[PDB]
């Protein structure tokens, strides 16, 4: 018998509204989700890299600074792994849903007005939630040097959970798993995802490994 303590949290009200808007509205082009995933990974990698300039020991948990992308058609998942800074449990609580972001309301208003489209979500400090354009459930595993490995999970509906993660140790960094919506499984096609990764990684200064899994 396995035992696990799970803590349940409620999304900040405006973040809840945004997630509802992202999930319950048709958007023609949803490619932004991948740009946001890679962007976040690159930012996380920059953070640990600059920390290592002033403190070399911070890299001992995992020497390589890299991104891995794994489309898994059988599992119906897209996974992105980075060896960036990672998030502590409290980092996840704060950054992944409970704290208000000042861009949230203004983004929603601009979406409704036509002043902004969904592709601009990253400019408003809420890029993470673009994952729900293509995924029903998002799982975020993370390991920061300061904490144990934790896993954040949400299928929206106003709540998320966080628990200690006893799955494969990351060493350091973040593994985000998108459980893809049936109508968005095209994003797992080998050539399509290859192309999109190349397109959305032109300025990314870390190696990217694209691993196509077949069963
Ligand atoms: N791969 C990751 N590694 C570390 N932290 C992350 C990662 N992805 C997201 N985060 C955290 O979640 C926050 C929200 O990301 P996002 O909504 O894209 O806003 P922004 O990138 O503008 O900060 C980030 O600022 C970061 O603190
Ligand atoms: Mg971001």
């Amino acid at each position: 018998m396995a035992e696990s303590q799970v803590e349940r949290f409620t999304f900040q009200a405006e973040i809840n509204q945004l997630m509802s808007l992202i999930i319950n509205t048709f958007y023609s082009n949803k490619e932004v989700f991948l740009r946001e995933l890679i962007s976040n990974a690159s930012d996380a990698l920059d953070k640990i890299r600059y920390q290592s300039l002033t403190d070399a020991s911070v890299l001992e948990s995992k020497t390589e600074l890299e991104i891995k992308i794994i489309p898994d058609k059988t599992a119906k998942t897209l996974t992105l792994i980075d060896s960036g800074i990672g998030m502590t449990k409290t980092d996840m609580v704060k950054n992944l849903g409970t704290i208000a972001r000042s861009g949230t309301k203004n983004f929603m208003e601009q979406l409704q007005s036509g002043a902004a489209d969904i592709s601009m979500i990253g400019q408003f400090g809420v890029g993470f939630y673009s994952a729900y354009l293509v995924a029903d459930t998002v799982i975020v595993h993370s390991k920061n040097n300061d904490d144990e490995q934790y896993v954040w999970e949400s299928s929206a509906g106003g709540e998320f959970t966080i628990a200690l993660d006893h799955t494969e140790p990351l060493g350091r960094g973040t593994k985000i798993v998108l459980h893809m919506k049936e109508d968005q499984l095209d994003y797992l096609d080998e050539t399509k995802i290859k192309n999109l990764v190349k397109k959305h990684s032109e300025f990314i200064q870390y190696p990217i490994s694209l691993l196509t899994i077949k069963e």
Side-chain angles (χ1 to χ4, degrees), residues 1-2 4-34 36-63 65-111 113-147 149-158 160-167 169-189 191-214:
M1 186 182 79
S4 166
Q5 299 290 325
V6 181
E7 196 170 356
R8 182 175 51 234
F9 297 84
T10 48
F11 282 111
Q12 197 276 331
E14 281 84 61
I15 293 174
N16 186 48
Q17 289 176 328
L18 176 67
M19 294 180 71
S20 287
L21 193 64
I22 283 167
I23 293 157
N24 307 298
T25 309
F26 176 87
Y27 299 98
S28 181
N29 181 4
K30 290 167 180 264
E31 277 175 21
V32 65
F33 89 89
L34 186 60
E36 295 310 312
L37 286 175
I38 296 164
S39 185
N40 280 157
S42 184
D43 287 347
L45 287 157
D46 283 345
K47 197 162 299 192
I48 194 66
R49 185 170 57 82
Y50 286 108
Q51 282 192 5
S52 74
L53 298 189
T54 54
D55 186 350
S57 74
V58 304
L59 257 45
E60 291 182 344
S61 40
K62 193 161 209 299
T63 56
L65 304 184
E66 56 174 308
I67 297 163
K68 296 194 175 78
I69 303 176
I70 309 106
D72 192 327
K73 204 136 64 168
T74 305
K76 300 186 178 169
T77 60
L78 180 69
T79 299
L80 193 155
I81 303 171
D82 71 71
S83 56
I85 186 71
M87 289 178 275
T88 67
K89 182 188 166 159
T90 58
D91 285 338
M92 305 183 109
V93 180
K94 293 192 294 188
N95 301 330
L96 267 26
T98 68
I99 296 308
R101 319 294 279 195
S102 90
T104 314
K105 177 166 65 64
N106 281 107
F107 183 54
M108 291 191 288
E109 289 176 3
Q110 289 196 34
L111 275 176
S113 76
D117 68 276
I118 196 76
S119 77
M120 300 167 173
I121 188 170
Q123 292 181 262
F124 291 78
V126 283
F128 171 76
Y129 301 95
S130 69
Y132 293 94
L133 291 166
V134 296
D136 289 319
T137 302
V138 179
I139 298 178
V140 178
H141 306 254
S142 204
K143 176 73 176 69
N144 180 283
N145 288 340
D146 284 349
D147 209 352
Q149 191 163 310
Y150 278 91
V151 57
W152 176 105
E153 188 183 326
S154 184
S155 302
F160 68 87
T161 61
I162 305 174
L164 276 171
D165 187 13
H166 296 116
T167 64
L170 293 170
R172 186 197 60 250
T174 301
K175 174 208 292 192
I176 181 161
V177 183
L178 270 48
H179 289 266
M180 306 292 289
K181 295 177 195 181
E182 202 71 18
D183 50 21
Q184 305 301 328
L185 291 172
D186 294 323
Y187 283 114
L188 305 183
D189 292 340
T191 63
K192 186 163 179 49
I193 191 68
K194 181 185 178 178
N195 282 352
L196 295 185
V197 170
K198 279 196 290 185
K199 182 190 185 176
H200 291 110
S201 72
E202 202 205 317
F203 306 107
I204 303 301
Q205 297 293 305
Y206 303 97
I208 295 171
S209 169
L210 182 66
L211 304 158
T212 309
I213 293 192
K214 72 152 178 183

